[PDB]
Structure formats: C-alpha cells, structure tokens
Amino acid sequence: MVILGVGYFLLGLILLYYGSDWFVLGSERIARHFNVSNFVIGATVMAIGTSLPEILTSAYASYMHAPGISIGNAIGSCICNIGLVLGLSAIISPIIVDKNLQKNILVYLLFVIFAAVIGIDGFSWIDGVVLLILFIIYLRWTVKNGSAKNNPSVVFSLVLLIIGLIGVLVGAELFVDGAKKIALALDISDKVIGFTLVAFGTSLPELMVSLAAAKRNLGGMVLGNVIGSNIADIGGALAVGSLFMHLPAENVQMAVLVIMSLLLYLFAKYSKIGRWQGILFLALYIIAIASLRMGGG
Numbered sequence: 425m426v427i428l429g430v431g432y433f434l435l436g437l438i439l440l441y442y443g444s445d446w447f448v449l450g451s452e453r454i455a456r457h458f459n460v461s462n463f464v465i466g467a468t469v470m471a472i473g474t475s476l477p478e479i480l481t482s483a484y485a486s487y488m489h490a491p492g493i494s495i496g497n498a499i500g501s502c503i504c505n506i507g508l509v510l511g512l513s514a515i516i517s518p519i520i521v522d523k524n525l526q527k528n529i530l531v532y533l534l535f536v537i538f539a540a541v542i543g544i545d546g547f548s549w550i551d552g553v554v555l556l557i558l559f560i561i562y563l564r565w566t567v568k569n570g571s572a573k574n575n576p577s578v579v580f581s582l583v584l585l586i587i588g589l590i591g592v593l594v595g596a597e598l599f600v601d602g603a604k605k606i607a608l609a610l611d612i613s614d615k616v617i618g619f620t621l622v623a624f625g626t627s628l629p630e631l632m633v634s635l636a637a638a639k640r641n642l643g644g645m646v647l648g649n650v651i652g653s654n655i656a657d658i659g660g661a662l663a664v665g666s667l668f669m670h671l672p673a674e675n676v677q678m679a680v681l682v683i684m685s686l687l688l689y690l691f692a693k694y695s696k697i698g699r700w701q702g703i704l705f706l707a708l709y710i711i712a713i714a715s716l717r718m719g720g721g
C-alpha cells in the first residue's frame with residue numbers, strides 16, 4: 425500500500441519527466457510541419473492537452489455539488505501557471521516577446537479582466553457560455569495570426585506528441601495517486617491540504633512541459649502554453665463547471681490573477697520575461713500560497 429504508493433509516485437515522475445520532453449519535441453516538429461509559430465502550438469494543442477485535467481476536474485467537482493472546488497481548481501491553476509510555471513521557466517530561458525505575441529498577451533489580459541468583472545457575483549451558466557465562446561474565438565484568432573500522402577517525418581512527429589501527452593497526463597495522475605496512497609498509508613492524509621493541492625496536481629503537466637520547453641530555449645512555446653492554459657482554464661474548465669452549478673465568487677484570487685496577468689503583459693510589452701521577472705513571479709506565488717485561504721475552495 426505504501427509500497428504501491430511509492431511505486432506510482434516514482435513511475436509518475438518518470439513518465440512526467442520523459443513524457444514532457446517528447447510532447448515538446450513532437451509539438452515543435454508539428455509547428456514546423458504546419459508552418460505555425462511555437463507560440464501558436466503552445467497556446468492551442470499544448471495548452472488544451474495539458475488543461476484536460478483541469479477541465480475534467482472542474483466539471484466533475486461542480487457536478488458533485490462542490491462548485492467551490494471547481495472554481496478553486498480553475499483559478500488556482502491560472503495563478504500557479506504564471507507564478508510558478510512561468511516564474512521558473514523565465515529564469516531558465518529568458519523571453520523577449522515580439523510585437524505580435526504582445527498583442528496576443530494583451531487580448532489574454534482583456535479576457536482575464538472580463539472574467540474577473542462578470543465573476544464578481546460568481547459565475548452563472550450564462551457566464552460560462554460567454555467565456556467558452558470567447559475561448560473559441562481566441563483559438564481561431566490565434567491560429568489565424570500565427571499561421572503561414574503519408575510522410576514519416578509527420579507521422580513520427582504526431583506519435584511523439586501523442587505519446588508524450590499520454591505520458592504527462594498518466595504520469596501526473598500516477599504521481600498524485602501515489603502521493604495520496606503514501607499519505608493514507610502513513611496516516612497523514614489531510615483533506616484540507618489535499619484540496620489545497622488540487623490545482624497544483626492538475627498543473628503538473630504544464631509545469632513539466634514548460635520546464636522541458638525552457639530547457640530547450642523554446643521561449644515562445646513556454647509563453648504560449650502559459651497564456652493558452654490560463655484561457656483554457658477559464659473559458660474551458662471554469663466555464664464547464666458553471667454549466668452544472670453556479671460557481672461562488674473568488675474575488676481575491678481573481679484580483680491576484682489580474683495583477684499577475686497585468687505584470688505579464690507589461691513585462692512582455694515594455695521589457696522582457698527574464699530572470700528578475702521570473703524571480704518576481706515566484707515571489708508573488710510564494711506569497712500567494714503563504715496567505716490565500718486553504719482548502720482549494
């Protein structure tokens with residue numbers, strides 16, 4: 425039991441580690457095949473693939489009548505994605521953002537502010553429908569602006585991508601299940617801590633994929649994955665949650681998200697996303713996890 429837990433834990437780590445690199449390599453190749461930028465592949469295929477845990481989690485939680493957990497997971501993931509994931513990644517591989525990606529980040533910022541505003545009284549199913557529609561528009565706009573028989577180069581590419589994605593998603597689940605089994609076996613299970621960590625657990629794919637990308641100096645891919653995952657987490661995970669049940673407002677967390685998103689845009693536009701920007705993101709992240717209410721909703 426503690427043995428099974430340790431087994432899952434370690435296997436999950438392995439699958440996350442190697443799976444993330446395969447996913448990145450396959451995504452980079454697919455981007456070159458389709459003549460789209462690494463940012464675009466990161467913001468679309470990679471972002472959505474890695475946010476599937478958040479979407480399922482938020483949908484399931486709201487369906488099980490725990491809408492606090494549903495929104496806690498969605499918004500907590502956005503804060504994790506900028507504070508921790510981008511924070512670490514930016515230090516590893518500093519990013520200078522080109523003029524068109526800047527505009528994409530501005531649209532991201534507007535989307536986040538819009539979500540925060542309509543969410544002041546919580547999120548209804550109509551809020552969800554609107555956010556989903558905007559999510560869809562964002563994707564098509566993003567692909568438009570970043571765009572332009574059986575080929576073994578392409579087949580290898582898609583195999584790498586899909587196997588890598590399977591690797592990071594199964595790996596994250598094993599890692600989390602393994603940790604939970606260890607905690608249970610050692611009699612240190614704590615539901616409040618466990619629910620606090622839900623957003624982190626679902627963000628393990630983004631974490632490892634972004635770090636793999638950053639190691640290969642693929643900064644546009646990192647930024648696309650972070651921006652796209654947050655939009656997927658709001659227009660997808662949060663949105664679907666709100667379809668099952670009204671989601672209670674999380675105004676403090678949304679304000680933290682809006683602040684981090686604003687900083688991300690300002691750095692992108694007027695500076696760079698490099699070492700000291702990443703240090704700031706991590707510092708704000710650490711302050712957030714030190715001070716936000718526990719329990720993940």
Ligand SMILES: CCCCCCCC/C=C\CCCCCCCC(=O)OC[C@H](O)CO
Nearest residue numbers: 531534535538542550551554558559561562
């Ligand atoms: C992704 C492309 C753009 C991204 C970001 C741009 C900002 C969008 C905000 C204005 C349009 C909003 C849609 C139409 C107006 C809906 C207003 C609203 O409040 O919808 C929810 C409603 O409150 C439920 O009762």
Ligand SMILES: CCCCCCCC/C=C\CCCCCCCC(=O)OC[C@H](O)CO
Nearest residue numbers: 534535537538541542543545546547548551
């Ligand atoms: C398309 C690009 C050009 C247009 C860019 C527009 C950007 C607007 C985004 C932030 C402003 C806030 C939006 C105002 C929406 C508030 C609606 C509202 O108050 O809805 C209450 C309802 O109860 C909620 O569920």
Ligand SMILES: CCCCCCCC/C=C\CCCCCCCC(=O)OC[C@H](O)CO
Nearest residue numbers: 600603607613614615617618619621622625
């Ligand atoms: C502290 C070191 C962190 C290690 C990284 C692992 C992150 C995932 C752990 C649980 C997330 C989802 C749990 C959802 C259900 C909670 C059930 C529970 O009570 O688990 C509590 C226990 O303390 C949990 O270790």
Ligand SMILES: CCCCCCCC/C=C\CCCCCCCC(=O)OC[C@H](O)CO
Nearest residue numbers: 441500501503504620621622623624625713
């Ligand atoms: C060989 C393998 C190399 C792997 C290298 C990965 C580097 C890990 C970076 C931060 C880990 C965080 C440690 C504990 C995570 C808990 C954070 C938390 O509190 O999450 C709250 C919320 O759920 C979400 O913001």
Ligand SMILES: CCCCCCCCCCCCCCC
Nearest residue numbers: 472479556560563564567660664
């Ligand atoms: C023109 C290329 C992009 C087309 C649009 C792709 C839409 C994919 C939608 C995925 C949404 C996942 C969450 C559903 C709730």
Ligand SMILES: CCCCCCCCCCCCCCC
Nearest residue numbers: 537540541544675676678679682
């Ligand atoms: C730029 C506007 C973003 C809004 C950020 C969300 C938090 C809303 C602050 C409201 C504080 C008062 C709440 C009383 C119900």
Ligand SMILES: CCCCCCCCCCCCCCC
Nearest residue numbers: 515516699702703704706707710
């Ligand atoms: C490639 C060299 C990287 C070295 C940069 C040091 C990283 C500092 C991270 C500090 C995190 C700050 C949180 C609050 C103390």
Ligand SMILES: [Ca+2]
Nearest residue numbers: 542545546547
């Ligand atoms: Ca609302």
Ligand code: NA
Nearest residue numbers: 471474475653
């Ligand atoms: Na994602």
Ligand code: NA
Nearest residue numbers: 474475626627
């Ligand atoms: Na995720």
Ligand code: NA
Nearest residue numbers: 501623626627
């Ligand atoms: Na997450």
